[PDB]
Amino acid sequence: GGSGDSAVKQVQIDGLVVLKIIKHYQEEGQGTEVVQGVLLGLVVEDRLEITNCFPFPQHTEDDADFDEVQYQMEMMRSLRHVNIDHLHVGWYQSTYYGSFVTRALLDSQFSYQHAIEESVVLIYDPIKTAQGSLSLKAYRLTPKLMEVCKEKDFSPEALKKANITFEHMFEEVPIVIKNSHLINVLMWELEKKSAVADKHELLSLASSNHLGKNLQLLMDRVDEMSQDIVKYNTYMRNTSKQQQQKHQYQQRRQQENMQRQSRGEPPLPEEDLSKLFKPPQPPARMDSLLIAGQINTYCQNIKEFTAQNLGKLFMAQALQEYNN
């Protein structure tokens, strides 16, 4: 039983879903992360099976602005009438820069997961990550955080929920290994559109050639990763700096002031002695980096592990191919 934790099984994303994702591929939300649709499915053998999606559009002029839910309500009735029902068991934002689970995506997920615990959150990653590995990134939210439910505030329940120490390298389910049983029709088209009408097959396959030759793919990956990751690294370092200074470096001075008092005045207070430690905002363990930021350490290691791999393959192929 590969099934998930405490309300749900795995996910299976039927091919006709992913066709409909790559229709709103990476536009209508390029430089803006836009939730491009809800994943509607049903509980199947050892898995969910997302059998259909409908896209959720928004006001994408160059910024994203949430709209009336007149769309979603009418469109989930539109699904219900010819097909099944509104059975939203997840969602997919493709969207912007090879798979990354932002703090906002963790928060939108937290609202989604606590409401319906039959859920995953997809991140459909096409050619943008140099394609590359883990094109379909699933990820559901730890049921620990759905038991120490809201909210991770800056001082209380940052420290306290950091001390509970729920996962932030948390498991991601596999998505496909099996016959989906809607292989059927698209199987029949393969013999037609190979050999005797392999126009559109060969067109798709020869995309590979120009994924290598031209403008700066791995170069631009490593460039964007030279900027994206150093931003995040610097942030933790100056975050950690100030908090560790309130933790120790301020205790150092005020306790050396506690020296001077001699730690007690018998006739009257001890105002000064009392008014040593008066709270700065972090006493320990700023949580939203420790959890949500660390979900993106994992994703940044993934992007690095992805961008590396196709490099490794060339470093075999290049040497070897010329060696003849």
Add this chain to the structure above:
Amino acid sequence: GHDITEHSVLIHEYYSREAPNPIHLTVDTSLQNGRMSIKAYVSTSMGVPGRTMGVMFTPLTVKYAYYDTERIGVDLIMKTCFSPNRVIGLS
């Protein structure tokens, strides 16, 4: 499927309330390779002051084309139809 019926004449009329030229697609689902997958049609004559709508359909044929990465997406399903072909070992 199957090709031209009395219902071609009827779903003509319902679509003639929209009133551009119609694009009749018929997806035959039969086993045989001698049966074309989808048989595109569009009426000629189609003069219409007669009965409902004359049905004498023009020869059309079908292709694929809208986008690359989505037929990279179909090729990804073709070779999953072959046998998965999960997403880990692509390269």
